[PDB]
């Protein structure tokens, strides 16, 4: 199916505590493969997936050099943003950046993105056409004008539509054994009596990959609303998720749980029986 490569950067100023924290992590789909942590000992881009360790020293030195360049740019950004918003030096602020590319089942470019946020909110981002910017407010307009005049988008687009996709293909290849896998969810249901007239049915999905999945409850062959928890990581490269529904004691049979996942040839339908 489709695949993606994404880099996530987090920068946090630390008032009166020196240099800002800088964390960068790279992902291929839902699998992290590298990381850089300003507070870690190596001060280098590090591998976080087996298939990426096969990359030579030229790769690691190049990624280390580039991630450090990102860190430096973000270090300046924090000061600049504080000024744009005329905020005091007393408070910590956050800069976040995300960029990468999506490819279809044919491993060909599908979409690109480069988004930037300040204090947990959209600040500026490339439009899906990768040729113009969308600035969230008045302060961000200044950045938009600077980047348009310097033709930033052009170089970013070149990356997002080509280089990004090339590396993604490469990674999907080198990590075929893990990245190009699909682990169907292992499912089951639990039943717990709330009161003497009510019972909650929980539908479980475990050990699946990728994280994408749909768990829907139905009472009499029709969608119904139900608690749904966020898909959570198991810690072994697979994910988990559950959906519960409160049902009148003695009506369990009416309810059915439906599971959709790319690892399931055909959707699953579970019932308390």
């Amino acid at each position: 199916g489709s695949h993606s490569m994404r880099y996530f950067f987090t920068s946090v100023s630390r008032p009166g505590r020196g240099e800002p924290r800088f964390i960068a992590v790279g992902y291929v789909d839902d699998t992290q493969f590298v990381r850089f942590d300003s507070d870690a000992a190596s001060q280098r881009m590090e591998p976080r997936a087996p298939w990426i360790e096969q990359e030579g020293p030229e790769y690691w030195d190049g990624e280390t050099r580039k991630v450090k360049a990102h860190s430096q740019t973000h270090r300046v950004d924090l000061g600049t943003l504080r000024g744009y918003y005329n905020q005091s030096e007393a408070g910590s602020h956050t800069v976040q950046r995300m960029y990468g590319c999506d490819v279809g089942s044919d491993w060909r470019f599908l979409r690109g993105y480069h988004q930037y946020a300040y204090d947990g909110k959209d600040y500026i981002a490339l439009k899906e056409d990768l040729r113009s910017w969308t600035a969230a407010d008045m302060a961000a307009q200044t950045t938009k004008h600077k980047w348009e005049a310097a033709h930033v988008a052009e170089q970013l687009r070149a990356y997002l539509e080509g280089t990004c996709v090339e590396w993604l293909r490469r990674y999907l290849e080198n990590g075929k054994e893990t990245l190009q896998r699909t682990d169907a969810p292992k499912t089951h249901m639990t039943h717990h009596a709330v009161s003497d007239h009510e019972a909650t049915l929980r539908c479980w999905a475990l050990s699946f990959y990728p994280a994408e999945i749909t768990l829907t409850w139905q009472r009499d062959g029709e969608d119904q609303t139900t608690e749904l928890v966020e898909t959570r990581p198991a810690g072994d490269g697979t994910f988990q998720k559950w959906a519960a529904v409160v049902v009148p004691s003695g009506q369990e049979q009416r309810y059915t749980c439906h599971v959709q996942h790319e690892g399931l040839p055909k959707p699953l339908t579970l019932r308390w029986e």
Binding site: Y7, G26, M45, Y59, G62, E63, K66, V67, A69, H70, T73, V76, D77, T80, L81, Y84, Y99, Y116, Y123, I124, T143, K146, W147, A150, V152, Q155, L156, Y159, L160, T163, C164, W167
Partner: peptide
């Protein structure tokens, strides 16, 4: 692999 040409705001 990381990109380049990332300028300051």
């Amino acid at each position: 692999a990381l990109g380049i040409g990332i300028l300051t705001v």
